C-alpha cells in the first residue's frame, strides 16, 4: 500500500481521459454516424483538450491501441484513417484489439506494458463503438464455421446469448427480479443525479453531428425510475431480465493518453492518475458475468492490495444479476460501486466502455484515492485493472 | 552484442512454433474451410506436441493472443471458441489483434510484454487467415463510412490498393518490372528447393480436412518457374503502364501458425526446451502511399534498439507483399539478398494476412544455426513497418 502510494519516474500516467456522450443505439444521437465519425470527431476534441507541448508534436505519440467488438476487422482500416485525418502523423503506428466488452481496457493495458518495457514513452488507448452500425456484422446464426465446432460442448458455450448467460447467473445464485429492479432503478438514480449536477461534463466531450446538432449529454439516464416502475418490464431472453435491468445498447468512444512520468515531467505535461496493474482471467462461457468475482481478486492479489483499500469501483453493469453477484461474491459496500451511476442507465458501447469507465473513474476519486475498472466479458472471461489519483 | 548472447532468466524464450502448409486462396486444400476449423486443427496438433507438463495442464496457458485481418471482430468469438475446443481451458483468456499484415508478429509482441512484465508466465501467440472465406467481408467500394472521411486527403490514403501503392513504390524508386521479376523468380526458386529438400517438413503440422484426406503441403510454389517466364503476365492494377503483376506479388491464401512462449526461468523449472528466443520488436509508421517501405524504416528501428548492426543479422525474413517494395527495402538496408528469405518468400509461398508475421517465426527459427541472429519484418497496409529480432537456441 504505502509503497503503491510512492511516485516512481517508472510509473504509467494517465494524462488526459475523455468519452464522448453516450448515444442510445438505433434511435439515438449517433444513429447516422458510423465508427470511423465517432472516432474522428472524438479525437479532433481530444487532442484539443490535450497539453500544449503534445497538441505541437503529435509525433510523441507512438502507438495508437484501438478497441472495437463489431466491425470487419475489430476496424483497423477506417480507425487508422480516421486518426490521420484528425492530425495523428502517419509515422505514428495503430493497432486494433477485440477482447470483446473489455476491449477498451484491453488497450489501456496494451499502451502501459509498450510503456513499460520501453518500447514506447507515450501512447494513445482509444474505445469505440457503433452498435447501430455494426450490430448486423454479427451473424444472428453464431459466427462459428465449422460443423462440428458448432456442435462441440466447450465451442458450443460462446454461441450463448449473453442474456441468457445472465440467466444463467440470476438462476444459480437464486437472483431475485426485485432484486434486479432494485439495482436497476438505483443505477438510473445515481446517474440521472450526476448528470443533473453536471458530474460527466468535465470528463464528456462533445461531438457535432453531420447534420448540425451536437450531443454532449448522455441519453440514457432519465430521472424518476424505480424498481416496481421496472417491474412493468417483460422478460427480454426467456426470465428475469429484462430491458430495464440490462445494459443500453449505445454508441461511444473514449480515449485515455498515457505516458511514462519521467518522461511526462519532462514535457511538462499534467498528470491526471496512474495506472497500477491489470489482470485478466477467463470463467466459464455458461455463466461469463461472473468474470469480475475471478478478476478483481487477480489484480488485488497481484498488487498485494485488499477490496477494502479501495475507493470506488466501476464494475459495468452488464445485466443486473451479474454485477449483484460480483458485488455480493466480494464483499463490496454498495455505496463504493458505480456511485454515478453504470451501464444499466448509461448504456454499454462494447468496445469503448473501458476506456469510457477510466475517464469516469478519474473524477470520482479524489487525490491519493484508489479505484478498480472491472467488466465481464462474453465468451467467458473478467478484466480489472487498478488506478491511484494524482 | 556478445551480452545479447548471454541467456538471461528473464529472456522471453520461444518453446514451440508451428504452422499449417499455406493453402492457395479459393483453389487450395482450405478453400471450404474457415479460420475457425483451422485454428482448431491446427491447436489439437501444436498442443499434441507439446512437453508433457503443458499437455496435463494447459492452464499454464494464460494468454492467448491471436492476429486476424479479415474475419468481423478480428475472429474473437470464433477463434475463442476453437481454442476451447482445442482444450484449452476457458480459464485461460484470449484477445483478439488486427495490426494488418503484421497482425501475427503483434502477437509475438503482445505475449512478450506481457511475460516481460510480469503479468503472465507462459503466452501463445496465433495468427491466423482464411482469405477464401473472408475475402467478401471487405466492401469493394472501401470500409471508411463517412463521406467526410473518404475525401479527406490524408484519410483516403488508406483506401489505396495495396498493389497501388506498390506502384508507387516501384516508380518513385525506379524499380524494373525485369528487376521485380528478377527477384520473384528467384523466391520462387528457392521455395521450389526448400519444399523438395524436406525444409519445411519440420515447421509444417498437418491439418485434417472434413473430407478425410489431409492438408499437409504448402500448395504455391510452382514447379520449375524461372523469369523471363514470369516476363509474359499483364500489370495487374494499372493498364498497359503498371510493374506490379499476380508473377510478381504475394498470392493471396489461407494458413494459421502458432508461437508458444514462456519466461527462461519458468521454461527451466518446467523443463520446457527451448528452441530460441525473443529478443526485441519495434514498429513505425510511413505514408501510407508508399506503405511498402516499412521495413525500410522499422529494422533499423529494432537494430538500434537491440545495439545491433545489419552486419550482425544472419537471415532477414523480410516479408514479400510485392517484389518492387521488398527489394527496395532490401537495397536501402544495404542487406544481401543471400540472407534473405533463403528458402523463398510470400511471392512464393503466400501471404495469409494475419497468419505471415507468425509464420515467419516458425520458418526462420529452422533456418538459423544455433547462437545466430534473425530478423523478422514486414511492411503494413496503411502505412506501418515492424521488425523483430530472435535468436537460435
Known amino acids: 500500500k504505502n509503497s503503491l502510494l510512492e511516485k516512481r519516474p517508472e510509473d504509467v500516467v494517465i494524462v488526459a481521459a475523455n468519452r464522448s456522450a453516450i448515444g442510445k443505439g438505433f434511435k439515438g444521437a449517433f444513429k447516422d454516424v458510423n465508427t470511423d465519425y465517432l472516432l474522428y470527431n472524438f479525437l479532433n476534441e481530444f487532442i484539443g483538450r490535450f497539453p500544449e507541448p503534445l497538441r505541437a508534436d503529435l509525433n510523441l505519440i507512438e502507438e495508437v491501441?484501438?478497441?472495437?467488438?463489431?466491425?470487419?476487422?475489430?476496424?483497423?482500416?477506417?480507425?487508422?484513417?480516421?486518426?490521420?485525418?484528425?492530425?495523428?502523423?502517419?509515422?505514428?503506428?495503430?493497432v486494433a484489439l477485440n477482447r470483446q466488452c473489455s476491449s477498451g481496457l484491453t488497450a489501456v493495458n496494451d499502451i502501459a506494458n509498450k510503456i513499460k518495457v520501453g518500447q514506447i514513452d507515450i501512447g494513445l488507448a482509444l474505445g469505440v463503438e457503433s452498435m447501430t452500425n455494426n450490430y448486423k456484422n454479427v451473424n444472428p446464426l453464431g459466427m462459428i464455421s465449422s460443423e462440428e465446432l458448432q456442435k462441440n460442448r466447450e465451442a458450443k458455450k460462446c454461441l450463448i446469448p449473453m442474456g441468457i448467460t445472465n440467466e444463467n447467473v440470476a438462476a444459480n445464485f437464486k437472483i431475485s427480479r426485485k432484486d434486479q429492479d432494485e439495482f436497476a432503478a438505483n443505477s438510473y438514480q445515481k446517474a440521472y443525479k450526476a448528470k443533473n449536477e453536471g458530474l460527466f461534463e468535465?470528463?464528456?466531450?462533445?461531438?457535432?453531428?453531420?447534420?448540425?446538432?451536437?450531443?454532449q449529454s448522455d441519453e440514457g439516464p432519465r430521472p424518476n425510475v424505480t424498481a416496481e416502475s421496472l417491474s412493468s418490464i417483460r422478460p427480454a431472453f426467456i426470465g428475469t431480465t429484462t430491458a430495464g435491468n440490462a445494459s443500453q445498447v449505445s454508441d461511444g468512444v473514449a480515449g485515455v493518453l498515457l505516458?511514462?512520468?519521467?518522461?511526462?515531467?519532462?514535457?511538462?505535461?499534467?498528470?491526471?492518475?496512474?495506472?497500477?496493474?491489470?489482470?485478466?482471467?477467463?470463467?466459464?462461457?455458461?455463466?461469463?458475468?461472473?468474470?469480475?468475482?475471478?478478476?478483481?481478486?487477480?489484480?488485488?492479489?497481484?498488487?498485494?492490495?485488499?477490496?477494502?483499500?479501495?475507493?470506488?469501483?466501476?464494475?459495468?453493469?452488464?445485466?443486473?444479476?451479474?454485477?449483484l453477484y460480483c458485488?455480493?461474491?466480494?464483499?463490496?459496500?454498495?455505496?463504493?460501486?458505480?456511485?454515478?451511476?453504470?451501464?444499466?442507465?448509461?448504456?454499454?458501447?462494447?468496445?469503448?466502455?473501458?476506456?469510457?469507465?477510466?475517464?469516469?473513474?478519474?473524477?470520482?476519486?479524489?487525490?491519493?484515492?484508489?479505484?478498480?475498472?472491472?467488466?465481464?466479458?462474453?465468451?467467458?472471461?473478467?478484466?480489472?485493472?487498478?488506478?491511484?489519483?494524482?
Open 202 to 215: 468535465d470528463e464528456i466531450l462533445p461531438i457535432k453531428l453531420p447534420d448540425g446538432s451536437i450531443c
Open 327 to 390: 458485488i455480493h461474491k466480494l464483499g463490496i459496500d454498495l455505496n463504493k460501486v458505480n456511485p454515478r451511476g453504470g451501464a444499466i442507465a448509461l448504456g454499454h458501447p462494447l468496445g469503448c466502455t473501458g476506456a469510457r469507465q477510466v475517464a469516469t473513474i478519474l473524477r470520482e476519486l479524489k487525490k491519493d484515492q484508489i479505484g478498480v475498472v472491472s467488466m465481464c466479458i462474453g465468451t467467458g472471461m473478467g478484466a480489472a485493472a487498478i488506478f491511484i489519483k494524482e
Open 259 to 323: 505516458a511514462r512520468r519521467s518522461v511526462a515531467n519532462q514535457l511538462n505535461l499534467p498528470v491526471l492518475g496512474r495506472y497500477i496493474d491489470f489482470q485478466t482471467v477467463g470463467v466459464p462461457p455458461e455463466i461469463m458475468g461472473v468474470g469480475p468475482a475471478y478478476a478483481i481478486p487477480k489484480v488485488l492479489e497481484a498488487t498485494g492490495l485488499q477490496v477494502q483499500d479501495i475507493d470506488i469501483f466501476e464494475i459495468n453493469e452488464a445485466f443486473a444479476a451479474q454485477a
Open 65 to 94: 491501441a484501438c478497441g472495437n467488438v463489431l466491425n470487419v476487422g475489430a476496424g483497423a482500416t477506417e480507425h487508422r484513417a480516421a486518426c490521420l485525418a484528425s492530425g495523428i502523423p502517419y509515422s505514428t503506428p495503430f
